[PDB]
Write an enzyme that holds these catalytic residues in place. Structure first.
Site, PDB file in Angstrom:
ATOM      1  N   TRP A   1       0.822  -1.203   0.000  1.00 28.41           N
ATOM      2  CA  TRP A   1       0.000   0.000   0.000  1.00 28.41           C
ATOM      3  C   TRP A   1       0.872   1.276   0.000  1.00 28.41           C
ATOM      4  O   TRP A   1       1.692   1.421  -0.926  1.00 28.41           O
ATOM      5  CB  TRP A   1      -1.173  -0.099   1.009  1.00 28.41           C
ATOM      6  N   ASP A   2       0.760   2.155   1.004  1.00 29.03           N
ATOM      7  CA  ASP A   2       1.486   3.452   0.999  1.00 29.03           C
ATOM      8  C   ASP A   2       2.940   3.286   0.482  1.00 29.03           C
ATOM      9  O   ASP A   2       3.735   2.506   1.018  1.00 29.03           O
ATOM     10  CB  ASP A   2       1.572   4.054   2.402  1.00 29.03           C
TER      11      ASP A   2
ATOM     12  N   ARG B   1       1.459  10.946  12.606  1.00 31.39           N
ATOM     13  CA  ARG B   1       2.187  10.082  11.649  1.00 31.39           C
ATOM     14  C   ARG B   1       2.553  10.799  10.340  1.00 31.39           C
ATOM     15  O   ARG B   1       2.119  11.907  10.122  1.00 31.39           O
ATOM     16  CB  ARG B   1       1.314   8.850  11.301  1.00 31.39           C
ATOM     17  N   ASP B   2       3.337  10.120   9.497  1.00 33.08           N
ATOM     18  CA  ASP B   2       3.578  10.477   8.079  1.00 33.08           C
ATOM     19  C   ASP B   2       4.529  11.669   7.848  1.00 33.08           C
ATOM     20  O   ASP B   2       4.110  12.720   7.344  1.00 33.08           O
ATOM     21  CB  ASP B   2       2.275  10.759   7.331  1.00 33.08           C
TER      22      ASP B   2
ATOM     23  N   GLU C   1      -4.418  13.453   6.187  1.00 31.85           N
ATOM     24  CA  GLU C   1      -3.312  12.474   6.177  1.00 31.85           C
ATOM     25  C   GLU C   1      -2.260  12.765   5.146  1.00 31.85           C
ATOM     26  O   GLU C   1      -2.507  13.477   4.139  1.00 31.85           O
ATOM     27  CB  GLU C   1      -3.793  11.045   5.913  1.00 31.85           C
TER      28      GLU C   1
END
Length: 538
Positions: free
Chosen positions: A72-73, A242-243, A335
């Site tokens: 995924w990501d 996150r991220d 996000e």
């Protein structure tokens, strides 16, 4: 546009990175999403405008790992300007992967970081249908990423999304989200999970046979939510943090910044919104009141985008700055933020789900974007003040459903893409979540076709438009994450080269160059010859 509120007034004016100014993505702004939707749109058809809607992905798609893992990501190797890199002839990407034996929705709590590589410099017509990627395996040895947590009682320990900065010698600084969970068998929490922004340094080893990574043996704990700017586990046990995406701002050379996802630092059940979050113009017959919104349940949706600043050149210590964007009473989740520079503007791109929008609001899954004259500015949400840049095909007139249970009346491409990332030239890569209908649908776990979004259409910086002439009616190559810069390096000296120079270098030099690039010793004469040639193109 259907009748509804006017969007909020934004100036795009810049503030200092260190200033306590946070742009708001307001209720007025977001309600423009409903205004843009065509109410006549029949069942299973797209109701959103085509220019801000991702081209439809086919349900018959190739799998990039031949189903060895769920993917995924994903992210490229970048520099401080977000150019994307090959090393010694190989494009390289990082991805979240999980054991293919798991149900796709159980991937999150067993997520690990792995990597893929493919030859650089291959024209689209010569590339394999599946992208031509080879799976390289996992980045971290078993047990390495758990090392930062004092409480070692975790039930699950994962590596989540980040970015990867590459140096000219092929060193990588992998920024990622290091996450510890503490759960009962039934899926409920014992105590709040613990997501942190971390770094691990490693290095590319690349030859004719392929790519391997060394290092990634040490993890540095960089940031955890503070409670003043970014919400903590004590304030909300389901807080988002996150991220990490790092970059240099052209307006502030010699500094390094980072954006990431957080939540506004309010105590969960005491959180409120105020007039600015609402953002309605004086007199608007569609304006809402603060009391109504505080009533509606919307105060549980308080996502933000954070900024941090590096305190050294090694990027091993960081300082929090005030958030640059808040979505209070608008969404829970802004996000995977990134800052994208173009035409002297700062564009903040983020992704969001349909499900995470506050009461009274709604919009498609996908890319939401904001423009301004600095990395901290009074950001203008793109396209009519809505924020929408690239939504999945969506009938906003009918329920959204979920990727594990599509609605009978919903577009089969509603969940076709997520974790979108904007690449140079406005190319957008994403992974496939679900494609299909109520009773015939498939999960993805592989990358979608890359698409093209033109940013700043018709001279107007606040407007984007999908290019439907790109590839085959808007669809480019499966899992196309192209490099526009090309490293050649023996692990010590290196140069970053353009596509054209990469080609010429690879052809002019011979097998001693192959030895050089593989880290084998060569004579000082041969080395100076190689390295003088390289230096002409770096």
């Amino acid at each position: 546009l259907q009748d509804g509120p006017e969007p909020s007034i934004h100036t795009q004016q810049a503030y200092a990175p260190e200033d306590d100014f946070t742009a708001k993505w307001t209720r007025a702004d977001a309600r423009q999403l409903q205004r843009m939707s065509d109410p006549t749109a029949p069942s299973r058809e797209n109701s959103m405008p085509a220019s801000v809607t991702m081209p439809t992905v086919p349900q018959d798609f190739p799998d990039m790992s031949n189903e060895q893992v769920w993917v995924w990501d994903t992210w490229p190797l970048t520099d401080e300007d977000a150019n994307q890199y090959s090393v010694n002839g190989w494009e390289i990407i990082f991805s979240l992967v999980a054991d293919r034996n798991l149900g796709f929705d159980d991937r999150h709590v067993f997520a690990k970081i792995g990597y893929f590589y493919r030859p650089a410099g291959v024209p689209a017509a010569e590339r394999p249908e599946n992208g031509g990627w080879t799976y390289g395996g996992l980045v971290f040895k078993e047990g390495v990423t758990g090392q930062i947590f004092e409480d070692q009682s975790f039930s699950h320990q994962t590596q989540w999304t980040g970015s990867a900065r590459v140096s000219k010698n092929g060193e990588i600084k992998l920024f990622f989200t290091d996450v510890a969970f503490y759960r009962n068998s039934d899926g409920t929490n014992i105590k709040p999970y613990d997501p942190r922004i971390a770094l691990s340094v490693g290095k590319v080893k690349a030859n004719k046979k392929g790519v391997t990574l060394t290092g990634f043996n040490k993890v540095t704990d960089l940031l955890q939510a503070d409670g003043t700017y970014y919400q903590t586990g004590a304030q909300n046990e389901f807080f988002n943090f996150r991220d990490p995406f790092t970059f240099e701002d052209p307006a502030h050379p010699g500094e390094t910044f980072m954006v990431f996802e957080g939540n506004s630092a309010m105590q969960r059940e005491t959180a409120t919104c105020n007039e600015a979050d609402l953002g309605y113009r004086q007199g608007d017959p569609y304006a809402e009141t603060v009391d109504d919104v505080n009533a509606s349940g919307a105060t549980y949706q308080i996502g933000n985008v954070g900024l941090a600043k590096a305190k050294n050149k090694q990027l091993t210590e960081w300082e929090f700055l005030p958030p640059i964007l808040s979505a209070n009473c608008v969404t829970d989740q802004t996000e995977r933020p990134q800052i994208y520079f173009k035409d002297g503007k700062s564009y903040l791109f983020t992704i969001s789900h349909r499900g995470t929008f506050a009461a009274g609001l709604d919009g498609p899954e996908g890319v939401y974007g904001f423009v301004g004259d600095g990395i901290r500015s009074d950001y203008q949400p793109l396209n009519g003040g809505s924020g929408l840049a690239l939504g999945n095909p969506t009938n906003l007139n009918f329920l959204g459903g979920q990727p594990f249970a599509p609605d009978v009346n919903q577009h089969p491409g509603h969940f076709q893409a997520y974790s979108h990332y904007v690449m140079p030239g406005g190319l957008v890569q994403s992974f496939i979540d679900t494609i299909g209908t109520h009773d015939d649908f498939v999960r993805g776990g592989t990358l979608a076709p890359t698409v093209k979004m033109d940013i700043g259409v018709g001279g107007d910086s606040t407007k984007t438009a999908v290019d439907y002439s790109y590839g085959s009616e808007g669809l480019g190559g499966w899992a196309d994450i192209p490099a526009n810069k090309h490293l050649f390096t023996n692990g010590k000296f290196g140069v970053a080269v353009s596509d054209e120079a990469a080609q010429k270098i690879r052809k002019i030099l011979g097998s001693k160059f192959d030895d050089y690039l593989d880290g084998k010793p060569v004579s000082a004469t041969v080395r100076a010859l190689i390295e003088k040639l390289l230096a002409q193109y770096g």
